[PDB]
Amino acid sequence: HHWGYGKHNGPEHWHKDFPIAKGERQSPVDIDTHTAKYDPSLKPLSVSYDQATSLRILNNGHAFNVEFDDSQDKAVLKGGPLDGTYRLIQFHFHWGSLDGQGSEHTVDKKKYAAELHLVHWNTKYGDFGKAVQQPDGLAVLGIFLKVGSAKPGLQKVVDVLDSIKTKGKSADFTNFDPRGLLPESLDYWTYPGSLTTPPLLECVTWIVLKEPISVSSEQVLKFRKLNFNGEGEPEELMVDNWRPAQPLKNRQIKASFK
Numbered sequence: 141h142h143w144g145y146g147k148h149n150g151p152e153h154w155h156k157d158f159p160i161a162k163g164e165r166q167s168p169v170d171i172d173t174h175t176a177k178y179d180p181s182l183k184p185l186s187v188s189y190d191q192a193t194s195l196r197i198l199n200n201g202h203a204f205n206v207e208f209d210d211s212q213d214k215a216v217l218k219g220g221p222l223d224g225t226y227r228l229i230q231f232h233f234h235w236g237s238l239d240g241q242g243s244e245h246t247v248d249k250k251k252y253a254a255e256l257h258l259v260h261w262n263t264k265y266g267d268f269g270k271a272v273q274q275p276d277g278l279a280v281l282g283i284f285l286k287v288g289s290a291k292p293g294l295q296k297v298v299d300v301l302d303s304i305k306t307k308g309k310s311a312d313f314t315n316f317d318p319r320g321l322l323p324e325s326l327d328y329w330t331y332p333g334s335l336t337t338p339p340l341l342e343c344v345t346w347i348v349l350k351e352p353i354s355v356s357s358e359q360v361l362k363f364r365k366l367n368f369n370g371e372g373e374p375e376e377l378m379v380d381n382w383r384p385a386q387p388l389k390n391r392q393i394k395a396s397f398k
């Protein structure tokens with residue numbers, strides 16, 4: 141009886157195994173755009189994905205992860221609200237059963253069809269496992285997806301999904317360039333939070349871009365053919381793998397713009 145996104149193990153239950161689910165800096169949150177404070181001290185985000193080395197794509201039973209070899213100084217996030225360098229380890233998405241839901245963060249209560257999370261760990265802690273034990277261990281760049289025009293740089297992901305339909309499946313996934321998933325603008329909101337999945341550790345500086353990318357209905361439809369079950373088990377479509385917005389508590393969301 142492990143955690144998930146089904147009818148009886150979802151976000152509302154997670155606190156029983158992971159009591160920080162009710163903690164002081166949980167994610168996601170609703171971004172009240174009127175209340176977010178412009179901070180002229182925030183720096184442009186520096187996203188340096190020029191040397192990124194993807195390796196593999198994995199169906200982990202909750203989402204799929206596109207993995208990067210993070211053993212060298214290659215794909216890094218810095219600037220913005222960050223002190224120091226954070227190295228890209230993987231990206232994944234959260235999405236809905238319908239175009240009208242799927243994002244984890246919301247913007248003035250608006251839900252997007254999906255949300256991309258590029259996960260980075262602070263190199264001052266040496267590797268990801270030690271970083272997640274620290275309050276400044278991770279930086280997650282969140283990007284909203286809306287349904288409209290196709291995102292060409294997404295299609296190589298979408299096309300491999302048939303090979304990783306079910307939980308535990310992986311496939312080689314080299315030479316994938318995450319720059320093709322970025323929107324035009326790097327304007328962002330930022331706040332201190334957590335992983336949005338168990339173990340819900342309070343280790344994340346969130347950086348959520350204001351500009352959503354567009355993907356086509358056909359692309360998101362392919363995400364929704366994935367399965368949460370393993371091979372040889374009854375089909376459980378991988379949809380609605382998002383945690384709802386959590387209490388903001390004693391936090392301020394800062395804006396890099398306007």
Ligand SMILES: NS(=O)(=O)c1c(F)c(F)c(SCCO)c(F)c1N[C@H]1CCc2ccccc21
Pocket residue numbers: 200202203205229230232233234257259268278280334335336337381
């Ligand atoms: N979505 S997240 O921002 O809270 C997250 C992280 F912040 C992470 F650091 C990690 S580990 C990244 C290194 O393998 C995640 F797996 C996930 N999430 C993955 C892992 C479990 C899960 C379930 C549903 C969608 C995605 C995922």
